Scaffold this active site. Structure first.
Site, short mmCIF file in Angstrom:
data_model
loop_
_atom_site.label_atom_id
_atom_site.label_comp_id
_atom_site.label_asym_id
_atom_site.label_seq_id
_atom_site.Cartn_x
_atom_site.Cartn_y
_atom_site.Cartn_z
N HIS A 1 -10.46 -1.50 2.85
CA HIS A 1 -8.71 -2.19 2.99
C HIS A 1 -9.10 -2.47 3.87
O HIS A 1 -7.68 -4.18 3.76
CB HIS A 1 -7.74 -1.32 3.12
CG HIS A 1 -7.88 -0.19 2.15
ND1 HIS A 1 -7.58 -0.37 0.46
CD2 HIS A 1 -8.56 1.31 1.68
CE1 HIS A 1 -7.67 0.61 0.11
NE2 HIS A 1 -8.88 1.82 0.71
N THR B 1 0.42 -0.96 -0.32
CA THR B 1 -0.10 0.60 -0.05
C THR B 1 0.93 1.17 -0.44
O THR B 1 1.26 1.51 0.46
CB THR B 1 -1.30 -0.23 1.33
OG1 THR B 1 -1.63 1.01 0.86
CG2 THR B 1 -0.64 0.17 2.21
N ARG B 2 -0.04 2.25 -1.50
CA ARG B 2 1.22 3.53 -1.03
C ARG B 2 -0.36 4.72 -1.09
O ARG B 2 0.24 5.75 -0.56
CB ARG B 2 1.71 3.65 -2.28
CG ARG B 2 0.93 3.02 -3.18
CD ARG B 2 0.91 4.12 -4.93
NE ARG B 2 0.33 5.49 -5.32
CZ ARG B 2 -0.87 4.92 -5.66
NH1 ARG B 2 -1.40 4.11 -5.79
NH2 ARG B 2 -1.63 5.94 -5.53
N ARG C 1 -7.35 -4.53 -7.34
CA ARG C 1 -7.70 -3.90 -8.61
C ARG C 1 -6.74 -2.83 -8.60
O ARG C 1 -6.52 -1.92 -7.77
CB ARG C 1 -9.10 -2.88 -8.43
CG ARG C 1 -9.76 -2.43 -10.26
CD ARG C 1 -11.12 -2.45 -9.43
NE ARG C 1 -10.94 -0.75 -9.91
CZ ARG C 1 -11.75 -0.69 -11.60
NH1 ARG C 1 -12.31 -2.02 -11.52
NH2 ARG C 1 -11.73 0.07 -11.99
N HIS D 1 -8.59 2.39 4.53
CA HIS D 1 -9.94 2.84 4.82
C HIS D 1 -10.97 1.31 5.27
O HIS D 1 -10.29 0.05 4.52
CB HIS D 1 -10.45 4.15 3.43
CG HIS D 1 -10.21 4.44 3.61
ND1 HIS D 1 -9.81 5.97 4.04
CD2 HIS D 1 -9.26 5.14 2.07
CE1 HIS D 1 -9.33 6.95 3.87
NE2 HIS D 1 -8.28 6.73 2.34
N1 ADX Z 1 -11.15 -1.65 -3.17
C1 ADX Z 1 -10.89 -2.31 -3.44
N2 ADX Z 1 -10.87 -3.86 -3.51
C2 ADX Z 1 -9.89 -4.19 -4.21
N3 ADX Z 1 -8.53 -3.91 -4.32
C3 ADX Z 1 -8.04 -2.78 -3.26
C4 ADX Z 1 -8.97 -1.97 -2.79
N4 ADX Z 1 -8.14 -0.79 -2.71
C5 ADX Z 1 -6.97 -1.04 -2.74
N5 ADX Z 1 -6.74 -2.52 -3.11
C6 ADX Z 1 -5.51 -3.02 -3.66
O1 ADX Z 1 -4.89 -2.74 -1.85
C7 ADX Z 1 -3.53 -2.60 -2.54
C8 ADX Z 1 -2.94 -0.97 -2.01
O2 ADX Z 1 -4.04 -0.72 -2.85
P1 ADX Z 1 -3.67 1.04 -3.20
O3 ADX Z 1 -2.58 1.99 -1.85
O4 ADX Z 1 -3.82 2.30 -3.65
O5 ADX Z 1 -2.48 1.57 -4.05
S1 ADX Z 1 -1.16 0.18 -4.51
O6 ADX Z 1 -0.36 0.88 -5.69
O7 ADX Z 1 -0.76 0.11 -3.56
O8 ADX Z 1 -1.46 -1.09 -5.32
C9 ADX Z 1 -3.55 -3.64 -3.83
O9 ADX Z 1 -2.92 -4.62 -3.67
C10 ADX Z 1 -4.34 -2.57 -4.43
O10 ADX Z 1 -5.18 -3.36 -5.75
CA CA Z 2 -10.94 1.45 -16.27
#
Ligand code: ADX
Ligand code: CA
Ligand code: ADX
Ligand code: CA
Ligand code: CA
Ligand code: CA
Ligand code: CA
Ligand code: CA
Ligand code: MG
Ligand code: MG
Ligand code: NA
Ligand code: NA
Ligand code: NA
Ligand code: NA
Ligand code: NA
Ligand code: NA
Ligand code: NA
Ligand code: NA
Ligand code: NA
Ligand code: NA
Ligand code: NA
Ligand code: NA
Lengths: 510, 510
Positions: free
Chosen positions: A203, A195-196, A289, A200
């Site tokens: 998550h 995660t970056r 996603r 919420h």
């Molecule tokens: N609503 C969601 N449904 C499914 N997977 C999610 C959702 N939100 C975030 N994720 C997943 O949570 C992980 C980290 O999310 P992010 O911090 O937003 O972005 S990422 O660049 O680190 O992948 C990733 O595997 C992402 O696909």
């Molecule tokens: Ca799309």
């Protein structure tokens, strides 16, 4: 599982008996020195601590080309993101194979000694299209062409010390440390969460759901090295992380910081993340996603498909040696007040609700309320505090070149007008006189929430020194944010125009 | 600092390659088996992990004696609390020196192999007088006489594994693990804080002051093994500690649980605590007012002087090799809104405020309000949840032997009446038929918040089986908590006396 390639290349452990010696070589008078860039610092720490196993240095042309075209190192090892030492022609010309260069941090702390294997000039368009999919607005491509050196230097590394960090001394675990952490707890099954962004309700639910699915403990493994431009800063995020880890049942989760520099490279990156999580001691890895995807480009089109990463990862499933736990869009269910993967619902019958990041930034910008069901209150509080709504934001009003009225008087009038509104903002007439030392402080003041009245513009060559965030142009031009009727429009008329603009955009609320 | 005696006697590490071998021996049909008592499990863990260095087993008569009369082991090493293996005459009689006994946990988990050196019957009177100051109400002396075995078994240990704990898996750091936690953070000065009570504002303030004066990081090291009878359970205290740790500046404190079994032996225990914390890697140890003291006896006299521990510890200063940071009573100054040691104020011109544990229990017992200045709200909330006010407490009413009205009818009448009031409490007419399997359940129901109506008394030889908390006797005798006017008093009259008695004591609130 076993580290990628079978051996954890923890070079700090390996080179422990050579520290003193290496330390002395780096500080010698005759050795060539290269100050590492912030991205190279993130990469070298991952290389030196075993995180990028089987890597033991920056990629030479042979391993790099293989990664570029084959998603593999020359020896066939599965590796999707090229990790290279990018320098400029001037420095490149000073080296040849067998050369030993010392790599520093901040021109003071010696990090490692690199033994040169080759010096080459990669074709950035091939790398850009083959690894990152070629769209020029892609963070990785933009960086590749606008910030990364044009010459790469391949070579083996010898550890002196991991890059210095003063924040979270205890939280940045190395692969070996994290492994002992799991071990001391008898955790033989651990699912990792990349995660970056702030986490919420969604998550928290998908991580617990993954824990239950895989019968594994939970590892929140956030990136605190470089991520996507415009992301919420890592300090604010750690606070959000340390807050949300308490909403997990006691004894189920562990938080560890990862100083990785993402390339926001969707599917390729996910493969890379898995390899990295396996090296760090995880037995499972979550890929949701648009994993590691940078969204859409200015034209509204996807950089990657919402599930390309899941697909790419699924295809390397048998050689990854780390169990992937995939998830379709987990969304909120109003009628059942719960969260669930979109692939287990819909077909109509059940209504769903989602708040996109764009919607959130906006709620944060206007001070709007954010649903109790969306995130945890204490998380929203932390976010509002570091990303304050408009009435708490800074801004600058720049008096355009076209102005014919008294710049001294127009500035004074704006200053006194603004000062009568109150509400805790600090204002100043700010003269930069085209000096870079001054121009570079503009965004600092804005960052502090202050309002700057700028008497005149800076020359175009200097523009790059100033961020344009909340910086507004008062001028007769069509490109002016606040457009003047005439160059000599009377002062009182101008003040009202500026006041109402700032209010329309929320800087003032009466 | 170096562990007490020079070597960290970490027997889990020392015997790592003997584990399978010791396990086999421990499970052989032939070997004599002793199932450890709770205090012994606490003590065996501290011996096996090096917390009790130089100890490598339970004391032989030689060392035990020295310690009792000399506050030192036979070889001169400073050591004030005897750690022995107490068994019964039946067991002791099967023991012979040079014998190997297997020590188990819950009669199933093999913990260690003990090679016996001797078996002796200590004079418990001398031990109570020399080590615990002789008052028969002293927890250590009461334990020594009513629970501890009459025979001691001295011998060296071979570790199989530390006692099993399923709560707080990663929080019970062993001396070797904490020392690693500190090193990974580069902490080379750590002041330790001992505690068996919840922490309030005063505690936060004194630990921070200690951090500042000693220029050290903070180690909150609470006891989770046996403490004083009547203390707040350790699960509750852990939640309290986890909440208060967040009120320290980020990165200044570390939380680690200590499975110590205290003896509440004030000054002697204080020295012992210093030695123990030194063994766990702390460079400084806080010793406040009445350290490890059990307070006052029945006649209201003190078991220890409020600063005896400080005096004793001071007199062993050059031997301890761990720096003691002493504190005088830290109190609240209303008029300046801050805490401070009483030695640096008063002048009889400065107002101070304090809430004793007794005043606190009481505020919790009646659901009274607790000053935001005394403790943090999150801490108080946790305390009320675990030690709820009377209207949320359970209780039992026992129809005394004297009663000549229908027990069956008086019982139903009390049940139907309580049910009228509502408020959540669950009620049950409970017949024990003098079966301890039933009698032992009475306090679980009270513990569950329930109201029990018990139609008749249990045999005098069963009282021990039943706790005394919130159990009231309905009778004509003087010993009745709710005294009837006569054994034949009409039911409605008895019901009113009972209802009003419970109201008077807060169980009901209209
Ligand atoms: N609503 C969601 N449904 C499914 N997977 C999610 C959702 N939100 C975030 N994720 C997943 O949570 C992980 C980290 O999310 P992010 O911090 O937003 O972005 S990422 O660049 O680190 O992948 C990733 O595997 C992402 O696909
Ligand atoms: Ca799309
Ligand atoms: N108000 C106070 N002022 C000074 N020291 C205190 C105060 N309260 C507690 N302490 C100290 O805090 C440490 C632990 O306190 P407690 O948990 O109540 O009891 S103890 O049995 O572990 O000593 C001890 O050193 C004790 O003397
Ligand atoms: Ca270039
Ligand atoms: Ca005009
Ligand atoms: Ca006895
Ligand atoms: Ca006293
Ligand atoms: Ca009568
Ligand atoms: Mg670092
Ligand atoms: Mg244990
Ligand atoms: Na493996
Ligand atoms: Na410098
Ligand atoms: Na696709
Ligand atoms: Na495999
Ligand atoms: Na599996
Ligand atoms: Na508008
Ligand atoms: Na059993
Ligand atoms: Na005596
Ligand atoms: Na000192
Ligand atoms: Na005294
Ligand atoms: Na010393
Ligand atoms: Na009363």
């Amino acid at each position: 599982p076993a580290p990628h390639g079978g051996i954890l290349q923890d070079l700090i452990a390996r080179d422990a008996l050579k520290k003193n010696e290496l330390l002395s070589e780096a500080q010698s008078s005759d050795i060539l020195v290269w100050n590492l860039t912030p991205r190279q610092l993130c990469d070298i720490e991952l290389i030196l601590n075993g995180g990028f196993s089987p890597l033991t240095g920056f990629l030479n042309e042979n391993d790099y080309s293989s990664v570029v075209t084959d998603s593999r190192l020359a020896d066939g090892t599965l590796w999707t993101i090229p990790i290279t030492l990018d320098v400029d022609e001037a420095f490149a010309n000073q080296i040849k194979p067998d050369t030993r260069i010392a790599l520093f941090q901040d021109d003071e702390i010696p990090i490692a000694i690199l033994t040169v294997q080759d010096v080459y000039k990669p074709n950035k368009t091939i790398e850009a299209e083959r690894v990152f999919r070629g769209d020029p607005e892609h963070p990785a491509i933009s960086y590749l062409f606008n910030v990364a050196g044009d010459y790469y230097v391949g070579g083996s590394l010898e550890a002196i010390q991991l890059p210095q960090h003063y924040d979270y001394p205890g939280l940045r675990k190395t692969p070996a440390q994290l492994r002992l952490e799991f071990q001391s707890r008898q955790w033989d099954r651990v699912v990792a969460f990349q995660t970056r962004n702030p986490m919420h309700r969604a998550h928290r639910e998908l991580t617990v759901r993954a824990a239950r699915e895989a019968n594994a403990k939970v590892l929140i493994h956030p990136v605190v090295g470089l991520t996507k431009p415009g992301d919420i800063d890592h300090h604010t995020r750690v606070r959000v992380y340390q807050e949300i880890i308490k909403r997990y049942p006691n004894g189920i989760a562990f938080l560890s910081l990862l100083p990785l520099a993402m390339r926001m490279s969707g599917d390729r990156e996910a493969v890379w993340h898995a390899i990295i999580r396996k090296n760090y001691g995880a037995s499972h890895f979550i890929v949701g996603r648009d994993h590691a995807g940078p969204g859409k480009n200015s034209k509204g089109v996807d950089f990657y498909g919402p599930y390309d990463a899941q697909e790419l990862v699924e295809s390397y499933k048998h050689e990854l040696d780390i169990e992937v736990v995939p998830f379709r869009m987990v969304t909120y269910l109003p009628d059942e007040d719960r969260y669930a993967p979109i692939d287990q619902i819909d077909t109509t019958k059940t209504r769903t609700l989602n708040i996109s990041g764009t919607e959130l930034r906006r709620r944060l910008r206007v001070g709007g309320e954010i649903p109790e069901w969306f995130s945890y209150p204490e998380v929203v509080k932390i976010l509002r505090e570091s990303n304050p709504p408009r009435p708490k934001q800074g801004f600058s009003i720049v008096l355009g070149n076209s102005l014919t009225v008294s710049r001294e008087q127009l500035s004074i009038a704006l200053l006194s007008t603004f000062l009568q509104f109150g509400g805790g903002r600090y204002y100043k007439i700010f003269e930069h006189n085209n000096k870079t030392e001054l121009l570079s402080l503009i965004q600092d003041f804005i960052g502090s929430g202050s309002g700057l009245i700028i008497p005149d513009q800076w020359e175009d060559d200097k523009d790059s020194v100033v961020g344009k965030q909340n910086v507004y142009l008062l001028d007769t031009s069509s490109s002016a944010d606040i457009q003047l009727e005439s160059a000599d429009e009377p002062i009182s008329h101008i003040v009202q125009k500026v006041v109402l603009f700032l209010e329309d955009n929320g800087f003032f609320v009466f």
